[PDB]
Amino acid sequence: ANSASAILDKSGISQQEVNDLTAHLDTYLKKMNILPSEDISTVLNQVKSDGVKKLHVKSREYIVNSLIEFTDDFEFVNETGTVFNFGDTGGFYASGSHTQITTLASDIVKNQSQSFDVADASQIQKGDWLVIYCTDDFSYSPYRNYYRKGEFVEVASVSGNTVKFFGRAYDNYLTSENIVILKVNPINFKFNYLKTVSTDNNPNVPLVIDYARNFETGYFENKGGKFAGLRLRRCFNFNIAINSAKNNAPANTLNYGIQISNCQNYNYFGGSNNSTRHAVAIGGDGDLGCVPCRNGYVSGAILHSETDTSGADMHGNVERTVYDHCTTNYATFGAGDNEYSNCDIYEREGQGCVLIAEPRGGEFKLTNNTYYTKTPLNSWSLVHGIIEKQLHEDLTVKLDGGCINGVGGASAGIVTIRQSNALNEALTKKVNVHITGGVSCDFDALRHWAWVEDGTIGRYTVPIGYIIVDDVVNTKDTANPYLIYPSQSTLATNVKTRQMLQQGVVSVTSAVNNTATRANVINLKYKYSKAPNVIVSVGNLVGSASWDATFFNEDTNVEPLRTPTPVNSLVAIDQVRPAILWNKKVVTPKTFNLYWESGIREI
Amino acid sequence: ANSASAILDKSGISQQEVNDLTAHLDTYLKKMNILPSEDISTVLNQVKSDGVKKLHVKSREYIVNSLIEFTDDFEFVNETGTVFNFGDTGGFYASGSHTQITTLASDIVKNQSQSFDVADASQIQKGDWLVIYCTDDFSYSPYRNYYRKGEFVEVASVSGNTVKFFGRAYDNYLTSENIVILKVNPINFKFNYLKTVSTDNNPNVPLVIDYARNFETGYFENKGGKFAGLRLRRCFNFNIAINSAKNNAPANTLNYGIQISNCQNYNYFGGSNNSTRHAVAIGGDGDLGCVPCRNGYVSGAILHSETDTSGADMHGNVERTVYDHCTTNYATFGAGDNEYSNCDIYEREGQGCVLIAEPRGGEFKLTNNTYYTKTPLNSWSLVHGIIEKQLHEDLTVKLDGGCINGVGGASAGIVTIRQSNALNEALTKKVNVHITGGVSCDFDALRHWAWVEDGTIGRYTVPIGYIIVDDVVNTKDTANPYLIYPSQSTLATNVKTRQMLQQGVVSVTSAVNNTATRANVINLKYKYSKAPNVIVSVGNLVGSASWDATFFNEDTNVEPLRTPTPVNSLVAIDQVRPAILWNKKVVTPKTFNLYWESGIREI
Amino acid sequence: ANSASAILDKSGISQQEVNDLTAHLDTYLKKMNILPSEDISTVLNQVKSDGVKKLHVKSREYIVNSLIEFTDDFEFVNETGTVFNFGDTGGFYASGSHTQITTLASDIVKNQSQSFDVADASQIQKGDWLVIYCTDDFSYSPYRNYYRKGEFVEVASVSGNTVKFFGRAYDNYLTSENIVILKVNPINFKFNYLKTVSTDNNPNVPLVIDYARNFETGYFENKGGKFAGLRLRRCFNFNIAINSAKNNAPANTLNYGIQISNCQNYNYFGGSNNSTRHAVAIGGDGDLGCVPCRNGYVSGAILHSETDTSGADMHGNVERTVYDHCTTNYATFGAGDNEYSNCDIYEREGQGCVLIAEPRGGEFKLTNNTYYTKTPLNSWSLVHGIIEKQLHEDLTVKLDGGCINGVGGASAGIVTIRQSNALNEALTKKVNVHITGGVSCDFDALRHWAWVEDGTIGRYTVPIGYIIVDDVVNTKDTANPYLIYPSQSTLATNVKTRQMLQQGVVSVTSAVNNTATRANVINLKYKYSKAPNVIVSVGNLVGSASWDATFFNEDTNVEPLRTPTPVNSLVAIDQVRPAILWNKKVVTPKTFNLYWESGIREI
Numbered sequence A, B, C: 001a002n003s004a005s006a007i008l009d010k011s012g013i014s015q016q017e018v019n020d021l022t023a024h025l026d027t028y029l030k031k032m033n034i035l036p037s038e039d040i041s042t043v044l045n046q047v048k049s050d051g052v053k054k055l056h057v058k059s060r061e062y063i064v065n066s067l068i069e070f071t072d073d074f075e076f077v078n079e080t081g082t083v084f085n086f087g088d089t090g091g092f093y094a095s096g097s098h099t100q101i102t103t104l105a106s107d108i109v110k111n112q113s114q115s116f117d118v119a120d121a122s123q124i125q126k127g128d129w130l131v132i133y134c135t136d137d138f139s140y141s142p143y144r145n146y147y148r149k150g151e152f153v154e155v156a157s158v159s160g161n162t163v164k165f166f167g168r169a170y171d172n173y174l175t176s177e178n179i180v181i182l183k184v185n186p187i188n189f190k191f192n193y194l195k196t197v198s199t200d201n202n203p204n205v206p207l208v209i210d211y212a213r214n215f216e217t218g219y220f221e222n223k224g225g226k227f228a229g230l231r232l233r234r235c236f237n238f239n240i241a242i243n244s245a246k247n248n249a250p251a252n253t254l255n256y257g258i259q260i261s262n263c264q265n266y267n268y269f270g271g272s273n274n275s276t277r278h279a280v281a282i283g284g285d286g287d288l289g290c291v292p293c294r295n296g297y298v299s300g301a302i303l304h305s306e307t308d309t310s311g312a313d314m315h316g317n318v319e320r321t322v323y324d325h326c327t328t329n330y331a332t333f334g335a336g337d338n339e340y341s342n343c344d345i346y347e348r349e350g351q352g353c354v355l356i357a358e359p360r361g362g363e364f365k366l367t368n369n370t371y372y373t374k375t376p377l378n379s380w381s382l383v384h385g386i387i388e389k390q391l392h393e394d395l396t397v398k399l400d401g402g403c404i405n406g407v408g409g410a411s412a413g414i415v416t417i418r419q420s421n422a423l424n425e426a427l428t429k430k431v432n433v434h435i436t437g438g439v440s441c442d443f444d445a446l447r448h449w450a451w452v453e454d455g456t457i458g459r460y461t462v463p464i465g466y467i468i469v470d471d472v473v474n475t476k477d478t479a480n481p482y483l484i485y486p487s488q489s490t491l492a493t494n495v496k497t498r499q500m501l502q503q504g505v506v507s508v509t510s511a512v513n514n515t516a517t518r519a520n521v522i523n524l525k526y527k528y529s530k531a532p533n534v535i536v537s538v539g540n541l542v543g544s545a546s547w548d549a550t551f552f553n554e555d556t557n558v559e560p561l562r563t564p565t566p567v568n569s570l571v572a573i574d575q576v577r578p579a580i581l582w583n584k585k586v587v588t589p590k591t592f593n594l595y596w597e598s599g600i601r602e603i
Ligand SMILES: CC(=O)N[C@@H]1[C@H](O[C@H]2[C@@H](O)[C@@H](C)O[C@H](O[C@H]3[C@H](O)[C@H](NC(C)=O)[C@H](O)O[C@@H]3C(=O)O)[C@@H]2NC(C)=O)OC(C(=O)O)=C[C@@H]1O
Pocket: A146, A203, A227, A253, A254, A281, A282, A283, A284, A285, A286, A315, A317
């Protein structure tokens, strides 16, 4: 008579039935005769096996020595101070699933297609999450074999074997290629609060969420783990909530606070992460369905590595991704069509702020950042790229505005792109560089703003479309940089440039018997890659009345009348020399101005 | 003795009283004798009628055939997999309320006033949410009768009949006009998780939240619904949480994933939505209190329509709204003072990326977007506006930076504004266009960067304040666009322009007996609307020693001395022709440079 | 037999044990014999003293007359409509703790160091939150004694007495200085919903959260409180969730909606706040550990003050902070390295939009804002700074793009920096101003774009590095501003400027017997600080065939041949005067063009 089943709630259900509406870990611990001090792996596995859809957990530290694999929807409601101690062997892994349903049966055109045919659409319906995936190694990028092409789509309609999807294709895919079509069954794994402990030797990421869509995470915190703290893998449309994901293990091939692995449409609106290596690593792995990362937006994040790599990262399978209003030591720039904007970027100890080491092609945008440097920037420039493989598309570096701080040096560079000597063939595609927007630099010395060249001078020409360096500011009067450094590739026939205009005035005084009156040669603060265009004009001094023919003639009745023909008497990459050529030799010394303007505008 | 009321908790309350602290749907189902497989409409209505303030729901799919109207605060705590199936007839509608309390009694000045008098302030206190609303059709915009002016305010203080409000008025409102003052009693309708199913024929939006303030939504997901998936209506200060709101119905007048209806101070920080038509529609309807939308900020969202409209939208009652770091197919630009920045914008099949179809006035800012095009852009330009009604204020298109991708064509345009032939009267206000910031375009052909003209050439002049096209890049050597296309309106007397400077060098060699030495005519890559300003100078070749009088004279003792007077011998919209005029005919051929610069700077 | 302890759940725990898994306020009220209508202070204190880690609260208004001090982790789960009425005396204060563990033992270099030695690292481990703090008054800024230097760090590793930390130092700290090292034990204080009422006389902030890290707040709302609605103090890595924090009290020294006090790494992604004074105040106080604020990012917020101060604020202990896509009446700009971008900024009644009143040094970035003005801007410029103390570093104002609206006036200024007469010594560091990006201004009159000067003209020179005003637009034909206003400091020897180029054309007609043919003097729309560089060229009219020697010669066999030597005949700050000097006096009148270009480019 003393059972909860014998007690009647006013509704007519029993007290047992009231109790059954809420699942608690403690009832399971009692029933399974597992103490809260013992490994609870079998208990967590039993709760999920029982199909419990929401589990409340009392605040304790619990041993969890197993890898707990959630494959159905599950929600934790954990009290603060609930900690799962995975030791050397445990972890949580929450995953949806895929199946290969068909193959591609029409060609997909990058940035254009919104539909494709399949061999079999019988298992496809509107709203499905499909994966287009090429199983061929290097099919996205030549840098790593597992950089394979693909993307996630949501089905808009099916008509026969024609699948219309929302949006536009991010890549080209051919019928003739090994293109498989997967269908995803996503998981909805939820938690208000999840806090974990692992040793630095535990090879399991404390939490992985895999094949999930349309979600915002709860609070997550880890201590330990060998490789990464939190991984979001093959996820689609999600926001990362503020967290304490970290890695503090001895250096290995990963060491990531958060790893965003093969995800699409991923924001991180504010937070901080610290790691032995990358704090946020954007990349992934090489299993079936591990698509390139794209449409990433990280904002307001403070991201640091303890070793001399970058806090913020983009691997070579990452495109269409931005860090905005973030702080990082160093930065990696991914495949292309990526951006760092409004960021505070600290130079690495090994020189340079931004590295392009796995370039595929597209734009590399550096918009209104603040850069903090201290090295001479002689071995690595502020922004440095090394092309070791053929590009898929033309590469453009676009540095628009911002503030470059430091001392610089006689050999410092702002943007340098080199072809590796290991790429022993001419580069098919082109490089462009665009530096603009009133970016300032307080270096005491700077060798160049932009340079692009092969790794062996005179081996190959690196094709260049255009280089624009049109609106930059060196704040120090000792700085004397090239706008564009001259060498074979930057001087090749078809290269077009815009190089910042300069202008000035110089007072000259003619002397008796002059047939020319020449300013001294003018050494330009900013040097061009080649002799610039030069305009020279002559005019009166401020504070003097308007010239008439009496200024240069002793008697205006005497003809020919003397006039000052303005010319540029000498031009070099680094020099102009305004002068006057007289039509009759000077009799009376006169003081007046010569004006000049230099520039290059070829595209 | 077997009642929960007979069992004593250690606190001294009964077990029934413990149970009563938490409301569950299952107790209601039992007590009301409604099976969980039956329509639960009467149960939900009874729970809310009972004043339950927080309801826990067990994961099942529940039939809900009625429209459930929440008019008091209510909170759901739903297990994952809780689904409300509305079928053809059901939905949820959560609403606050309004009353008309008074009328406006002083004139309000746009961007200036922070107070207004009323006829009766007896029902107003500090902190109240008031609505200023004009009941007269077309009082905000001439495009649709229900585009009526008004705004939401919060009261800062009341002194007699003077209401001081926080902020500054967004519009002008006159005593003499039909201006009513409403007071809002907001609802606080909450959910952790809400997932719904409706047929595509169900005319109810699955969830509407109306007259709520100061909130962040929980997770929401719908399948089905005829018109829209989620509507936020007459809401004030809110953030939209990530969701799966959608529409997939046959095309009708709406088909919106999320509709933001008549809202003020509305962010959406990351997400994705797909719809038959607009994914996010910003607009609303025409009931009392349906103010213009303003102060919208959507960030990090991927927004697509299946039909050839736009994923991202702004209707003609929308101002002060931005999409930033979003992706969309096509784009609508609302009333004015709106922006798309840092967006990926795909061209519609029907040509063009951005449409201004209900313009009221103000700025239309396109900042650092990437545009993906494939059509010839001959019928609709990249950015295209049609003025069919008088503007309320001058209209400015400001395209600052970015990357324009595609092939273009011989008739392609970047920015075109036309007056409709249906507006058979001269336009009162002005149009301005400002294209700057180093925006690039890789078209093989382009007709113009900017053009503004009436729909019948020579009918009316469209007034233009200024057109600036000062810093653009056509990357292809085949492109030969007008900066500003010349026609009646762009050439009218009072129009002021800035048109990008060009410059170059040409080597010339004089011939024996020349009295002039003329470069061949130079055809400019970028064409002006009218003959540009031209500067010509003469100078030495690189690699040659500084000129003296011996360069152009066989014997410098013989006077007059020959000098090279530099001139521009011919000017056209598209041509310059530097030359030298000699003061005595040439005896010795000489090779030297002529330099030129063109530009227009009128404002 | 009627105890919950006598009833057995199916798990084997008693019904009392089931009940004990959830804490409710109502059980405490019963057991403590406190009615829900009485002061519940003793009940809240007992719940927290009992170590309850999660408390559920039924919706009622509860009297709380005490200041409830949470010093251990605590979580509320409050029903909507739960209100804590603090009256005149109550409040909530949730705090972590600190201890001074050691002192600094090596010098730290701003923007460079990532490690420091301590006197004792025995209490330090990896992951610890440490505070570096200088106890000396004015050690961050000279404006207020409690502006002391320091920062928060997280430990990466400890080796002996060497502490490596994540990131890079934000300031310099010397061994020799009074630099203490604190260790923080943070609190995790959580709530879903917290709504409070206080009188306007209650000196307690309704909620303070102090010494917490890695969190996102829940929903918070207050009515009342004398000084501020919500304070986040000495917090590290957090996001502020949307809220209704406010202040409506009579003006005092604070009156803040939200006060961010001495915090680091703080985002606010969307919201609205209203206050008597600042809506969001960023600053803090002067206790041990009250570091400068840094790494703030507020986005999508509508922020207003009722009095004529600013809605958005940054005090003089704030650096590295941005408001983006926000709306405010007026704005304060903090210490430096701060930004307002993409904001709508309303002019205060007392003139001006943006105030720099406690400058320390660094950049003050105003990027793409829209400014709404109505005063003549004669007493305070749009952007105005007053230097009353020595700067720590050079100060740069960088106004890049945007839209300046209003009438202006004959004395209006855009950027003005003045040295106070109260600073009766020469300023050590420099001021720079950079105005660019195509910023527009629709004023009918404007005196200057940029001016920097001492408070007594001719007393001291304010050192200026550079002033650039290179790309601005006055849309009105009546506006005639100086680019840079000329006075002692802006004209001093070492000052370098870039001042926007101008150019034009004028047709002239020679007359019989001319020895010169002079255009009338040209009055420049934009005036320079000093006589500009001037280029003059001569050329043919549009529509005329290419010039040859016949244009200026009646018989080309007669030598010398007449040629038109182009010159600038007069230059002033505000004037040019193109002319031709003839080598033989004119016989036949000719009509032709003179062209001119002006500019200054000195850095
Ligand atoms: C747990 C373990 O030890 N696994 C072995 C390891 O597996 C590798 C392999 O699957 C590659 C393709 O992915 C993972 O390592 C990447 C890593 O994700 C980073 N890449 C990107 C784009 O973010 C990093 O930069 O590169 C490594 C890498 O290429 O090794 C994965 N590692 C882990 C720890 O999960 O290696 C191999 C193997 O054959 O090389 C087999 C095991 O599964």
